[PDB]
Every structure is written in structure tokens, then in C-alpha cells.
Amino acid sequence: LPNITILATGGTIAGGGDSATKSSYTVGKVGVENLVNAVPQLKDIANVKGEQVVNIGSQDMNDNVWLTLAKKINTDCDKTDGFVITHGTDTMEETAYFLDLTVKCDKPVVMVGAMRPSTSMSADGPFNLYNAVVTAADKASANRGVLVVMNDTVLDGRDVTKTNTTDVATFKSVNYGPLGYIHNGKIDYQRTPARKHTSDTPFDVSKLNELPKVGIVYNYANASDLPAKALVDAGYDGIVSAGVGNGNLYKSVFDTLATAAKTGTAVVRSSRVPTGATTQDAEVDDAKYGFVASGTLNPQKARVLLQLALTQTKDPQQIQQIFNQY
Amino acid sequence: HHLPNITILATGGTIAGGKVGVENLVNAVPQLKDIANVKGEQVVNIGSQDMNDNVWLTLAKKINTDCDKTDGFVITHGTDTMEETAYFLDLTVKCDKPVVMVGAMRPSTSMSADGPFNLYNAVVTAADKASANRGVLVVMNDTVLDGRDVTKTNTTDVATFKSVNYGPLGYIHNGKIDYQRTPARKHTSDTPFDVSKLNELPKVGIVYNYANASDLPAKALVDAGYDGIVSAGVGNGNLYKSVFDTLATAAKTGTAVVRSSRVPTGATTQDAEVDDAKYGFVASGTLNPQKARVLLQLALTQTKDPQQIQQIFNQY
Amino acid sequence: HHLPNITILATGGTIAGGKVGVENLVNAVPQLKDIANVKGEQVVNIGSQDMNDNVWLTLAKKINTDCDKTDGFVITHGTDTMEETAYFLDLTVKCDKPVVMVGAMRPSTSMSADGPFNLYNAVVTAADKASANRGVLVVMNDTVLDGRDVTKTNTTDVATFKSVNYGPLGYIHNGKIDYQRTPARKHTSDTPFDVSKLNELPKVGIVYNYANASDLPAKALVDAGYDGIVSAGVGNGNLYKSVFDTLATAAKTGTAVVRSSRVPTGATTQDAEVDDAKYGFVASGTLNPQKARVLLQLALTQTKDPQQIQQIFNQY
Amino acid sequence: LPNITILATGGTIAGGGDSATKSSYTVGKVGVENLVNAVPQLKDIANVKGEQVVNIGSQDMNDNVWLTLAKKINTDCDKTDGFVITHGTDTMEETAYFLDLTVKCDKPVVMVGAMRPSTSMSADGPFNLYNAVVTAADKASANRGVLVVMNDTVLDGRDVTKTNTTDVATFKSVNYGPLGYIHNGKIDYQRTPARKHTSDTPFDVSKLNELPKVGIVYNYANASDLPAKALVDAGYDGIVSAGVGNGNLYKSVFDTLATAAKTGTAVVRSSRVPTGATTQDAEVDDAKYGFVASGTLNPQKARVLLQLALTQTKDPQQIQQIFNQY
Ligand SMILES: N[C@@H](CC(=O)O)C(=O)O
Ligand SMILES: N[C@@H](CC(=O)O)C(=O)O
Ligand SMILES: N[C@@H](CC(=O)O)C(=O)O
Ligand SMILES: N[C@@H](CC(=O)O)C(=O)O
């Protein structure tokens, strides 16, 4: 059986409530050893080793944990056959894309969480963890980038997003679809992401203590420019706009970001709209303003790539090329 | 043989690209005369990414004032913020006659432009007696959508508008609608919100949550004396710790705080990970951040008390 | 403090895998006693791929007879044909108290089995006074779905059941339902269908359309004297020429013919490519083939006239 | 500009009504030359040549037209840079998969239709045809199998299906997602089908006058076995079951197909359920009965592959292997 390493970071998968039928609970309580022992069927498919990296709710996920995870996977690659990262669902789509761009280990790296606490009736954690280990143990899972496995489905770290606040089926790759489905412990892979990932990217965080500062501002009717101005006044390296429609901006926000771009702030136009690309050649002349269009990357995913782009370059044309390749 | 009188109120948008006038918009679809007596009025001519409180107030007052002068309204509008205007009017229009919003995802000069048939179907909907008393509506891609749940789901697709939590009210085929649903949430004349004499709306901003989120946007809204802040939370309305800290302080120093979610479907519920009663927060339910802002502004015209705002978010 | 009386009628399905008894099903979820006084009765114990007219008649008669002896019903059922049983009961149950169907997509012995919480939520729904007068319901994956529109959309997903044309009625969180919709189509006590004295239902079969489709299935149903045939058409109810020829003959020689569609969402409409009045055909609207069969069988207990059947397909 | 050949077969894209605002129309009236002249923007992107193969509604599509199309594309491959097939929407998903398995030409083959007649207000035909030609002209479209292009989206011929009876956005690849989106005449491809297609299949129809007979029977409550018996009595080479749930069958239908399989009839279990695979190792012991599980192929798609499988073999184990590879 393959050796599989579980790196635990917290989340509702490790959470507990006082009743199996009531919704209130606290995240990231139980340890990695309890999650493993809760699924004795794991011993049929893998030799599982658990390590507790942190124990937080992923609403509190941060740069420091991301750097810890990437360095640990890259350091321990030769010591195991694959990785499973247990994680909160709230920002799993962000961590998955970060690791998708920075992990250099060729072996499967699979993220997994649970929408229901471990104590709940029909808790989804146990089978999710089982299927995550199935995926990390599958030879065919290698070289597909960092993966998220939820609700019997293998999803690429770039397109995967949380589509619903409570549904166990919440995780979907809403633009390009899943890579494969899991049935009876086997996967029929019919897709693989074409965008460059893992060892095909230039992003190398092995020696980094911190990441460039990138914030996100929302657009809506009558939007205040004060959030954007606050990020500019703090000297943020980049700002992602969650625009309306095809990456459009309320005039006040547009005006502030255009002025900041001329001072050197990197500005990426994304969209609050949950599917579809923020394109070039629509209503915003990105070349004129020095802006970058995010494509299908939603605002929090665009932040991930912008932070890493800014470890390499501050030039908008080069950043746009990065947003066209990764 | 007499046809209903339908008033088109034009605000801009790609359906008017907003540069072409409301008379040009009407004459482009001569078949409108087969179904309605159409009169057009230009309210503004803007891209809806620049929609604002003043235009919202103008539209609600115009519809309420002119209700008895027409049989139904169509509002032509940009698609980017149509879902916000639709819900604002859903809460403030007191005319029970049909009010239908419509836009276009493709330019009027483009191949297979969707604007012409979109407008035709919007007039069909405003002219159907069955459309009355269903709240303010959005009509796009042969579908009638309630103004509360409707949202733009895709950046470019002509089929982008969907009521993603509770579904559409009816589909349009051959100029006829089979309505199978109506919104249960209280709208129009069943709400207490009355903007007839207001020149401005309470100030409500939106902050985004994500890994490592800065508290600076939330702090800037607080420093500016904002009346309310809507959080686009992660998952089920959850907050990054720094943002949580700032909003907890704001809620105990006057500011109304509504937890919504950046997640595109599903409710932000009570009784999950955040003790709303302890912090004086309000949970937005299925209202996404920009919709929650609409209701929070109007709630703040009535009350600043968090329990009373929560009740408003449970009824409208 | 008193809790509602809820009767569980068991028919089989993976939620009972149908091999385990109804008492075993109940005792597996002890928290049921926190929300209801539960009594279980075994009606049949079959896989729902073998569901049939006799079980449908038994269930409708049992619910109608026992209505005044309980406060609500839960029917445990296989997922494969739950959407058909749900609509049959939707049309024939005259009890206005909640009737909720539920199943499970994973075996009860499997990791993260969905059956236990599914049953809990089904009892929550049957015990909610707000669930009355909404027709027969299906409760799956924290969602309340009307029996007319609900359908199985995926072969394995625990989230498979969706009301794909008009959306759900409400979502369940923390044991509470926020209902925002109700079906406008006439159901239960608002239909004329009365099976109380029937031992059998009119014979209605379904034929599939595709490229090069054989007319032999349609011919075999005609040769057997079927009372009606539902066509799973291509696109908007269209028929392969050979199948069209056979059904046109059948419609003029007694047989009721309903055009539905193999396409999983959207209505089969009148006034498209098929002149239904010329051929004596009925268009099924949003009813998929197996749902259209349910309504056609019941229509044929009232009338054989195509215009009157079309009216039934426009009202129920 | 590339040379693009339009092969016309009919459909609503070629249909016309007496009014732009009323829904009634007739299919396959106007000729290929009228469709081309209706889109003068095509001359900006390609040298277009039209040929009328047939002019039918695709509800009347049949084996003979399929064989004509495959032979024509394979014969004329060297004479053009890519193919667009205008087609009715009702069975486009069937023809696309047939050509996906039998076309040996390496150059892009793109199918396209229209949900609204050419005479209708906001008719979708003109822009659909434009985007189909864009796709056939794109070098990156080659080697992705036969494609369907509808509503700004490039879809693989295997997974693409018509999901709605009237919506212009009806065509979706409901299990694995689209291959790319089209904006401003350009495609960002992020996926390609892993299942073997075109020149990687053994199916060679170049000398065939006819195809094996395969019919489809529906399952539902109280289902009659008479449709299945009628196909068996006619000596059908194969029968596809549109089963309930995960490919399950009503007992009467099961009994008839099991008896037929022992006489040599090929029996494929598919599902009337619109998404998801009909799997092995669920409730039906396929090996015991000699049945084949269709995977994600819906009943009409499973018929296509079964017909072609039956040109090579009647052995259920070999047919199952075909259903696992193509
Ligand atoms: N609050 C949790 C949500 C979850 O795990 O589902 C987290 O992200 O850690
Ligand atoms: N920018 C435009 C988008 C559209 O009309 O579709 C607007 O909202 O006004
Ligand atoms: N074959 C089963 C499927 C299920 O229960 O999910 C049935 O319908 O009875
Ligand atoms: N009946 C038409 C439908 C369409 O083209 O949309 C056909 O398949 O030819």
C-alpha cells in the first residue's frame, strides 16, 4: 500500500458540536490522529501518517500557513507517496491554488474538508477523507496539479470554488469542469488542467518569509472609494477589484485604482460574478490604464496569482502574461 | 381591441449602446406595437457600473408617482447592477402593476444581438395581467425572474441571469408566460419602506473576506461614519479575524453590521460559527452582499437596532 | 409540550438496504423522538426500479384513509422512481397534511451514509405546520422539493434531487425551514383524480426518440391496446419520422398520445414544429416522460378526448 | 485566411417562420448559400465554401447521413483547412459523437446549429455560425476530436448534450465541462478530452453501407417489456436500456434483456438520468448477465458507440473494454 501523509490544518472536518442534530459547532478542535482513527477503512488502501501543521478555521488562513505548507511538501516529497491536506472549506479554494502554483513535488497533493462537523448526523468528513486518500494513492493523479477532492469528485486547484454556503456538494469547477469522478474507490480521469502548474511555474517560495501585499475591493452601486484608498495609503503592492459584470468598476473606485497604477501599484480586474472570465477588450482599456484582466480567476484566486507574480515582476505587461499562462 | 399602455423608463446599459435614446430603442422593435401602446422616457443614460442612490430614488419616485398613468413599466438598464436596482425597487415601489427590468449582454450592433427580443419579452411580461402582484421582475433569456433572488451568474453569457436559490417564476414562449411561482418574501406595497420624501439613503459599504484579509477597508468605512457595513464573508458568512475584530467594535459603537457571503448561492444563516446576538450582527440569509446592502440601507431608514434589522432580514 | 404524530410508510429503497424493516429504520435515528411521535408501517419492501401501479394505488388509499389518524406522513422510498411516485401522490392524495417522501443515495452501512439525516429532515418537514397545503414533497440534501418538478439529475450524487425548472420550495437548516415558494399547479385536493375505488390504472407506455429510431416499440404498445403512449421526443418534443407515423395512426384510432422530451429541462410546448391539433396529440409542458405518464394515466381515468387531456396537462 | 468547408444538413439554423415574434416554423428550408451570405463577417476570418449534403430536420437524422458525413470528411480532408457542419440541434449530440469516433481527418471538425429560426428576432444562428468558423479556423482546435460550438462555448462531441428544450444556452458538457470559451473571436482552450477519438479509434466506416441495428428502451414504474421484446423479435444486434438511477431496469425489462443477451444480443445499461455514469459494481452483476455498463454515455450516445463496437465484436467483455476507452 502507498505511504500517504496527512497534513492537518483545521476546519469543520476537525470540528465538533454538542448535538448531532443542531448546527452550531466550533472548528479545528480534534487532532489528526482522531480523524484517521475515525476512518478505519483507510488502512485498506494506504499507510497513513498524520502531522498537525496548524489547527485553525480557514476563515483565518494566511500567508504564513501557505508558505509553511509549500515548503513542507517540497521538503518532504521524497519521504512519502502522496499528500492529503485537511483544511477548512471556507478558503480551501485559495490554499489549493497557492499550492498549485508553488508545490514542486511531482506526487499527488490532495486537499479535503467537510461541510458538516464530525459530530453531525451523516457527517461528510469520513468518506471525504477516504476518497481524498484514494485520490492521493492513485498513480493517475500525479502531474495533474494540486487537487481538491469533495463529494466523490476530483477538482483542479485552479478552477475549484465553493459555490454554496451549506451544501455538501458545494465544491465545483464552475468554468471548466471536474477532472474525474470517484466510484467504489476508483477514478476515471477524463481531463487535466492545461494551465501551467507546480513544477511548470517559476514561482519559488522556498526562501520567502512573506508575500507581497495584495488586497481585494468590492464593486456595487454607489461604491465608496475609501477601501481602495486605504489599501493605496498603506502601500499595498497590488489590489484586486471584484468588479461588476465583465470586470467593470464604479467610477470612484476606477479613478483611485487608475491613479495608483501610475504610481506602480499592480491592479488586477476580476469580477464578483461567480462564473466566466474577466476578459480583455471589453469596456476597460487595460493597456491604457496599466491594469491586468484576471480571466476566469475570481477575486481571491486572482489575489493568489498576483502575490506570486509580484515576487517576479511589477510590470503590468509581464503580469498580464502571467495571468494568461497560469 | 385595445392594448395595454406600457411605459419604458430608460437608464442606459449595453441594451442602449448607454448612448442611444429611448425613442431609438423603441423604433428598433416595431413588433412592440402588436402587443402594447409604448411610451418612452429617458431617466438617465449611464453604464450601470455607475448606478447610484440618486438614480434609485428617482426611479422609485417616478414609478410611484406615475402608477395611475400607465398599465405597466419596463426599465431598460445595464446588466452589471440590474440585480441591485431590481431589489431596491422590489422594496420601495408601491405600484402593484407590473414593473419589469431588462438589459442586453451583447451590443445592439453585434451579430445575434439579444436586446431586441429581450425588450419584446419584457413588454410581453409587463403587459400580462398575471405579472401584477409578483414584485419587481427581471426578464432575460425568455425567463421571468423575481427581483429578490435574481443575480448575474456569468460575465458574458446571454443566459447569465438566474434566480440561483429559488428558481424562476415563469418561462416565456410564443409571447405567453406560464407562471408557476411567486416570491413569498414581502415586496412592494407589503413593505414599510417609503422613500417618497428622501433625498439620500443611509451609507452602507461592502468589505470582502479572503485569506490574510486586511482590516483597512472595514476601518476606512468606520472612520467615515458609515451607517452600515455588509461583510462578503467566506463560506457561511465567516470573517477573517482582523475584519471580525473591526466589525465587532463597529457594531458596539453604532454601526449596523450584516454578515453576507462571497459564496454565490445559499444562505448566510444564524446559529453556525458566529454568535450574532453576542456581537450585535445580522445574518443576511440568501441575500448576497450587494442585495444585503440594499436591504440594510432601507432598514436603516426605519431602525438602528440589530434585533429589528434581523427581523427585517427575516421578512423582506 | 406535545410533539406531532408522524407516520412513516416504508416501501424499500437503499435507505432500507430494501431489506431492513421500518422499526429498524426508526430506531437508527433516536433523535426523531426529539421532534415527533413516530409510528412506522411497512407497505412493501422493494427496489423502486420495480415500483408499479399497485403500490401507487395502495399508498394513495392508505394516506387518504388514515389522514385523520396522524399529523403528517413520511414515505421512505428508493431513489430511482421516487420522482414518479411523488407526482402520482401529488395528484391523488386528498389529505392536506404534509406528505414527504425521502430516500438515500448511499447504503446505510457505508461511510457518511446520507439516510439518517435525510430521514431526520424529512420528519422535520412533515412536522412543520408550514409544510401543509404545498402538495406532496420530496426532502433530500437539506432541501424541500415539490413532487411535480423534482427529478433525479445524477446517477450517484447525494445532491441528485433537484426541481430543475422552477426550483426548490425551501431549505432546511438547524431543523427549521424557510419556505419561499409553493407550486402554482393544482395538486392534491384541488385535482379531480380519485383513485379510492380503482384496482388498476389505464395502460400508458413510453417510447424513446433518437437518430434512426425504430417504430417497433411504439407499434408493440399499439398492438397491445395501450390506452396512452408518451413520447420521449428529441428537443422540443419532436419525433423520428417512423415513430411520428405510428403515433399519428394510433392517435386517430383511440390511443392518447403525449409528446414529452428526453431533454432533461424545459417544456415541450405547443406551437413549435408539430401541429398537435391536426394529429390529436397533447404537449406535456415541463413534465418529463415518466411524469407525463403519471398524469396521462390519471387523465385517462376521466377522459379520452385530446383537447380535454391537453387542458389537464395545462392545469396539473 | 484558412479555407473552411461548410457541410449543410438542415436544422432550425436553416429554418424560417412567417413572423419574427411567433414560435412556429419549419426546419431545413434555406440553402447553405443563404446562411453564408447572412453572415458577411465570415469573409473577415475565412474563405468559406458551402455544400448541401442533405436538408432535413435532425429529428429525422439516420445512419445513412452519418455514413455520408464521415466518408465525405475523410475523403475531402486534404482539400480544406477545417469543416463546419450545420445541423439540427435535436440530435446534434448523436451525430457529433458518431463523427468523433469515425472521422480520421486531423483538421478541426465543428458542428453548429441554432435554437431560434433564422427569421426570428435575435436569431442565434448568425453568431453561432461565425463562432463555429472561428473554432474551425483555430490551429489550436486540431486534435481535440469532433467539436460542437454553441453559445460562445467549444464542447467536445462525447460529453456535449442538449440540456433544455428551448434555451439558446442549451448545449452543455454536463459531466466534464467545456473545452474553451470564445470571446472576441479568440478561444482560450483549457481542456481536451482524454477518451480516445478520431484517428485513435479502430472504427473504420469507409466501406460500410449500413450500421448494426441498435435500439433504445425506456425504464420507469410498471414498464412494459413489449418494446424490448419487439427489438429482440426483430433480431436487433444491440439494445441500450435507458435505465432508472444507476442504470437499473424494471424487472420485466431486465428479464427480457437477460434472455436476449444469452442468445447474443448486445445489451448496454445506460440511464435516463441526465448526468453521471452508469457504473459497474452497483446493483447489476453485468458479468453474470453479459451486460455492458455505459459510463457517462447517455442512451443515445451509448447507441452510437454500441453500433460501432458491433462492427468489431459481439463479445460483451470486449464491448465493455470499448466502453471503457472511447
Ligand atoms: N469555518 C470553517 C468552514 C468549513 O470548514 O467548512 C473553516 O473554513 O475552517
Ligand atoms: N457595463 C454595462 C454592462 C451591460 O449593460 O451589460 C452596464 O451595466 O451598463
Ligand atoms: N435501486 C434503488 C436506488 C436507491 O434506493 O437509491 C431503488 O430505487 O430502490
Ligand atoms: N427540429 C430541429 C431542432 C433544431 O434544429 O433546433 C432539428 O433538429 O432539425
Every domain of chain C and the residues it spans: 1-202, 203-316
Q: Are C107 and A127 in contact (CB under 8 A)?
A: no
Q: Is A52 helix (H, G, I), strand (E, B) or coil?
A: strand
Q: Are C289 and C306 in contact (CB under 8 A)?
A: no
**Ligand 1 nearest atom to the CA of residue A11, by list position:** 9
Distance of CA A276 to the CA centre of its chain: 18
The structure was resolved to a resolution in Å of 1.6
Q: Do A300 and B236 touch (CB under 8 A)?
A: no
Which residues lie with the beta carbon below 6 Å from any ligand 4 atom? Answer: C 235, 238, 273; D 10-12, 27, 57-59, 88-90, 113, 115
State the residue for C-alpha cell 430511482. Answer: C80
Catalytic residues of D: 12
Residue A75 C-alpha cell reads as: 521538503
Say which CATH topology domain D213-326 has: Rossmann fold (3.40.50)
Q: Does B271 touch chain A (CB under 8 A)?
A: yes
Name the CA radius of gyration of chain A, rounded. Answer: 20
> In whole angstroms, what is the distance from residue D60 CA to residue D90 CA?
9
Q: Do C163 and B163 touch (CB under 8 A)?
A: no
Q: Is D184 helix (H, G, I), strand (E, B) or coil?
A: coil
Superfamily of domain A1-212: L-asparaginase, N-terminal domain (3.40.50.1170)
| Breaks after residues in chain D, judged by C–N over 2.5 Å | none
Q: Which of C117, C158, C174 is closest, CB to CB, to A121?
A: C117
**Ligand 1 nearest atom to the CA of residue A91, by list position:** 8
Atom 1 of ligand 4, residue of closest alpha carbon: D57
Q: Are D209 and D310 in contact (CB under 8 A)?
A: no
Q: Is the CB of A125 under 6 A from ligand 1?
A: no
Taking CB atoms within 8 Å and a gap of at least 24, the contacts of D143-146 are D143/D106, D143/D192, D144/D108, D144/D179, D144/D189, D144/D192, D144/D193, D145/D100, D145/D192, D145/D193, D145/D197, D145/D198, D146/D96, D146/D97, D146/D99, D146/D100, D146/D103, D146/D109, D146/D110, D146/D111, D146/D197, D146/D198
Atom 7 of ligand 1, residue of closest alpha carbon: A88
> In whole angstroms, what is the distance from residue A310 CA to residue B306 CA?
42
Among residues A100, A227, C156, the alpha carbon closest in space to that of D271 is found at C156
> In whole angstroms, what is the distance from residue A28 CA to residue A224 CA?
36
Q: Does D223 touch chain C (CB under 8 A)?
A: yes
Query: What is the largest distance, in Å, between two alpha-carbon atoms of chain A?
Result: 59
Q: What's the N-to-C CA distance of chain A in angstroms? A: 34
Quick one: DSSP state of residue A274? Answer: S
> In whole angstroms, what is the distance from residue C250 CA to residue C222 CA?
7
Q: Are C212 and C243 in contact (CB under 8 A)?
A: no
Residue D189 C-alpha cell reads as: 482552450
Among residues B85, B207, B269, D186, the alpha carbon closest in space to that of A299 is found at B207
Q: Do A193 and D191 touch (CB under 8 A)?
A: yes
Query: What is the largest distance, in Å, between two alpha-carbon atoms of chain B?
Result: 65
Phi first, then psi: give them for residue A100, nearest 5 degrees. -50, -30
Q: Does C180 touch chain B (CB under 8 A)?
A: yes
Residues facing D156 on adjacent strands: D147
Helix axes A226-233, B216-223, angle to 10 degrees: 120
Residue C173 C-alpha cell reads as: 437548516
Atom 7 of ligand 3, residue of closest alpha carbon: C78
Q: Are D293 and D240 in contact (CB under 8 A)?
A: no
Residue D45 C-alpha cell reads as: 476570418
Q: Are C224 and C195 in contact (CB under 8 A)?
A: no
Q: Where are the beta strands (DSSP E) in C168-241?
A: 170-173, 176-179, 204-208, 228-233
Q: Which residues of D are annotated as a binding site for substrate?
A: 58-59, 89-90
D88 CA to centre of ligand 4 in angstroms = 4
What letters, b where the CB count within 10 A reaches 16 and e where it falls short, cover B84-94?
bbbbbbbbbbb
- The domain at B203-316 falls in which architecture? 3-Layer(aba) Sandwich (3.40)
Quick one: DSSP state of residue B268? Answer: B
Q: What's the CATH number for B1-202?
A: 3.40.50.1170
Amino acid at A160: V
> In whole angstroms, what is the distance from residue B10 CA to residue B32 CA?
16
> In whole angstroms, what is the distance from residue B105 CA to residue B114 CA?
7
Q: Would you put residue D95 in left (φ > 0), alpha (ψ -120 to 50) or beta?
A: alpha
Which residues lie with the beta carbon below 6 Å from any ligand 2 atom? Answer: A 245, 248, 283; B 12-14, 47-49, 78-80, 103, 105
Name the CA radius of gyration of chain D, rounded. Answer: 20
> In whole angstroms, what is the distance from residue C197 CA to residue C64 CA?
12
Q: Are C303 and C202 in contact (CB under 8 A)?
A: no
Using CB atoms within 10 Å of the CB of residue B177, give its burial: 0 to 12 exposed, 13 to 18 middle, 19+ buried.
Answer: buried
What is the strand order of the sheet A291-293 is part of? Answer: A214-218, A238-243, A266-271, A291-293
Check the annotation: does A89 bind a ligand.
Answer: yes
Q: Do B158 and D151 touch (CB under 8 A)?
A: yes
Using CB atoms within 10 Å of the CB of residue C201, give its burial: 0 to 12 exposed, 13 to 18 middle, 19+ buried.
Answer: buried
**What Å distances lie between residue A319 and A41, A290, A293, B211, C124, CA to CA?**
46, 10, 10, 21, 53
Residue B91 C-alpha cell reads as: 422594496
Q: Are D14 and D35 in contact (CB under 8 A)?
A: yes
Helix axes A316-325, A299-309, angle to 10 degrees: 120
Using CB atoms within 10 Å of the CB of residue A144, give its burial: 0 to 12 exposed, 13 to 18 middle, 19+ buried.
Answer: buried
Q: Are A217 and A123 in contact (CB under 8 A)?
A: no
**What Å distances lie between residue D68 and D28, D74, D108, D214, D293, CA to CA?**
18, 10, 18, 19, 29
Sign, CA torsion A219/A92/B247/A19? positive
* Angle ∠(D228,D231,D234) on CA atoms, nearest 5: 150
Quick one: DSSP state of residue B286? Answer: T
State the residue for C-alpha cell 472511447. Answer: D326
Work out the number of other CB atoms within 10 angstroms of the CB of residue C274. Answer: 23
Work out the number of other CB atoms within 10 angstroms of the CB of residue C305. Answer: 12
Q: Which of D177, D189, D194 is closest, CB to CB, to A177?
A: D177
Among residues A164, A178, B156, the alpha carbon closest in space to that of C168 is found at A164
Q: Do C168 and B167 touch (CB under 8 A)?
A: yes
Q: What's the N-to-C CA distance of chain D in angstroms? A: 34
Q: Does B80 touch chain A (CB under 8 A)?
A: yes
Q: Are B183 and B135 in contact (CB under 8 A)?
A: yes
> In whole angstroms, what is the distance from residue A46 CA to residue A29 CA?
25
Same fold, D1-212 and D213-326: yes
Query: What is the largest distance, in Å, between two alpha-carbon atoms of chain D?
Result: 59
> In whole angstroms, what is the distance from residue C66 CA to residue C69 CA?
5
Q: Which of A176, A190, A193 is closest, CB to CB, to D194?
A: A190
> In whole angstroms, what is the distance from residue D144 CA to residue D141 CA?
6
> In whole angstroms, what is the distance from residue A136 CA to residue A145 CA?
12
Distance from CA of D291 to the nearest CA of A (A): 19
Distance from CA of D135 to the nearest CA of C (A): 25
Taking CB atoms and an 8 Å cut-off, how many pairs form between chains B and D?
56
> In whole angstroms, what is the distance from residue B73 CA to residue B71 CA?
7
> In whole angstroms, what is the distance from residue B251 CA to residue B233 CA?
16
> In whole angstroms, what is the distance from residue A89 CA to residue A13 CA?
9
**Subunits touching B (CB < 8 Å, at least 3 pairs)?**
A, C, D
Distance of CA D97 to the CA centre of its chain: 4
DSSP alpha helices (H): ranges in chain B? 22-27, 53-66, 82-92, 115-127, 216-223, 241-251, 276-279, 289-299, 306-315
Q: Which residue of A has its CA nearest to D278?
A: A183
C20 CA to centre of ligand 3 in angstroms = 14
Q: Do A277 and D173 touch (CB under 8 A)?
A: no
Q: Does C181 touch chain B (CB under 8 A)?
A: yes
HSE, CB side, 13 Å, CA atoms: give it for residue C173. 20
Q: Which of B168, B171, B185 is closest, CB to CB, to C180?
A: B185
Q: Is B35 helix (H, G, I), strand (E, B) or coil?
A: coil
Q: Are A288 and A235 in contact (CB under 8 A)?
A: no
State the residue for C-alpha cell 420507469. Answer: D220
Residues 6+ apart with CB under 8 A from C87: C136, C147, C148, C291, C294, C295
Name the CA radius of gyration of chain C, rounded. Answer: 20
State the residue for C-alpha cell 444491440. Answer: D238
